[PDB]
Symmetry: C2
Subunit: 373 residues, 2 copies
Amino acid sequence: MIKNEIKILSDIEHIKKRSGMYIGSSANEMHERFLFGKWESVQYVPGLVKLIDEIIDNSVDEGIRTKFKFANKINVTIKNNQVTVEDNGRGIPQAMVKTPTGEEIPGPVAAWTIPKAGGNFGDDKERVTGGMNGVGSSLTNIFSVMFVGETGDGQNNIVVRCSNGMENKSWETIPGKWKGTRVTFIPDFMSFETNELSQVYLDITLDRLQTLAVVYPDIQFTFNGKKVQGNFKKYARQYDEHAIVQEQENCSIAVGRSPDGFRQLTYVNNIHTKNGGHHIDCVMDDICEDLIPQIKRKFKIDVTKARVKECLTIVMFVRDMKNMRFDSQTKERLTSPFGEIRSHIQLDAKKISRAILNNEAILMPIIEAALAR
Amino acid sequence: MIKNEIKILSDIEHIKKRSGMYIGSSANEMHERFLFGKWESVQYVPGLVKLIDEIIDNSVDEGIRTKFKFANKINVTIKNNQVTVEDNGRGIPQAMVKTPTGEEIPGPVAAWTIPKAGGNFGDDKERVTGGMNGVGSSLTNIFSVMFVGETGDGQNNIVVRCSNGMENKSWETIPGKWKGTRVTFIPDFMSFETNELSQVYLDITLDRLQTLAVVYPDIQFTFNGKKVQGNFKKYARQYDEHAIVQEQENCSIAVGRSPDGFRQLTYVNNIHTKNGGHHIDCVMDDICEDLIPQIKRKFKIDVTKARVKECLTIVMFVRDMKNMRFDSQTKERLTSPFGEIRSHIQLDAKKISRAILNNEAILMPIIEAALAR
Ligand SMILES: Nc1ncnc2c1ncn2[C@@H]1O[C@H](COP(=O)(O)OP(=O)(O)NP(=O)(O)O)[C@@H](O)[C@H]1O
Ligand SMILES: Nc1ncnc2c1ncn2[C@@H]1O[C@H](COP(=O)(O)OP(=O)(O)NP(=O)(O)O)[C@@H](O)[C@H]1O
Ligand SMILES: [Mg+2]
């Protein structure tokens, strides 16, 4: 008989025992991510990419919450299964904060050593950064053999050092004049199903850095000491040379061709909702409510919404969004209410619909495939 | 400027603030789901469905942990925005449990009021239960205006009463002789994007109860006092009359026809991974690696794996699967390693490939579509 004994778990212990809920999958798997604009087959562990992207997203959040004035040179380096992110933001405040137990724990150490502790817990309606869960940076270390974070406020330098899988930790304060953040850690391969950060992880990281540079032209991302140039037109042409691009103040969409199924790549603020959500669905619905009547008047053939939808590879970017509620800790599916997404996103469906109706490189393959079948 | 102040939250407060990662979505969205064998478009909040499925999963988990000797009558009732799940299982042990803070609290109250507490935290390679996180019933009690958990081990009735949305809790013990469990909660709609437990949610719960009675024939689930009859043959024929059925000791498969894209409904133990996972991908690979040479030799045509796959509707049921993990708390993607699932599942793909080849009612549409293009 199975021993049903009700146990009690601590936060660190629960996270280590139940990492699947907090970093997504933890075993190497196959996917079809858009690597550098190519729908190629990729094999990787979502946990490691998620942990790296946690710190990268923290740097991007520091950039965006300061209106890109501070934290605009995010030097991300990944060499020999070691991650090392640098940014020139305001950094962790040195102001004292109080734990529920009453113990006095400073800012950086509380942020980088305990979960459910972050600066994104304020008013949600005005939250613009990509962080909401207050867990995670916590996570690398929490999933790391060594994790040293060096913050500087221009007057003090705070070094938070953790080792033995976050079990050992210590924070120290030194006089200094640095202003920024330098988070460098080494992953723990005992948890994940891997032993080394191969070239594929660096390629995925470079792809997200390129996408973030395209999304945010102000921030100058750097990878392994090499600058990253952010231009949307080249990024969209990397998908298909005949892509149709429409930019707005908060929406930035591009339409390509999907010959072997359905494809997409969407970003909300600085979060890669790679499992879609409601924004892509709402945008595509609005586009189709204009295509279907127009294609009816033009080619006089009845086509369903899904038939047209399955032949487009939409790459779409959203900026300055608020209330980005997700459904997974990995934040892979934007589940914000459709009304809020429609209110914030001001994309003109008629413009893109007319643009792709006027082009023979996209509509004609759809028409030919429908007529042949 | 964005006011950046580090805040620290406990388990309950963080769950209330960040419910997205713990009950999936919280805004009523539209999917295309299998309701009563029909690929019907449905509109609902996944949060409430996950909330009910948590208690139902705990009941089924107790049942299987007793090897169906106990908790074999899971009477589930949903009336007037209220859920009442009763079973005749062993019940929660009265044994005292010591929290990390040192406080002494009973087992039922520890399970039903504070999260990260469960009896499923055994050796992760020996979990035969559909629960792994120790947060489920505590989660459903957090989002409940009222919640009464009445348990009995045959010697004493333990009643845990929670009210005003997790803020009020009170446990009591009375001499008694009842042996079983009864979880009755009324969900709180102030957080969810809904107002009442309308008929769609009852339909979804009844469909899941039918599915559970099909995969688990010993448990006599009764919905609103109405017995649910479980027969896999009729359940499969509900989808498609010409469906091909193959039953094994731990795996049950039913293959049909899909005219409007790809559809699937798969179950591992008692969890509806409605976004697929790694087991169904293994099934597809094993089926295609034998079907493709056969169709190539028969009809002298070349068809890709995706083209054949997308024209099928497969219903798959898996039981007694050990060491299963999920990328989300909602458990909608089984992220166990491919090798472990392949070792556990003893599917014979050659048999189903031969059966589908010998049928001219499902393969012929695929071949006709291939010849059309
Ligand atoms: N480069 C940086 N500059 C300034 N502050 C930083 C930087 N990196 C991290 N932080 C702070 O460190 C904390 C990190 O918490 P973290 O574990 O990443 O959860 P989070 O910030 O809420 N994001 P997420 O978990 O993705 O929702 C945040 O409160 C940030 O304020
Ligand atoms: N109705 C019940 N019958 C039998 N055992 C129960 C019941 N409710 C709770 N338990 C036990 O008490 C714990 C608390 O329930 P719950 O909060 O759902 O934890 P859990 O089962 O680990 N949840 P999850 O991992 O999300 O499926 C469970 O792990 C069981 O050990
Ligand atoms: Mg983030």
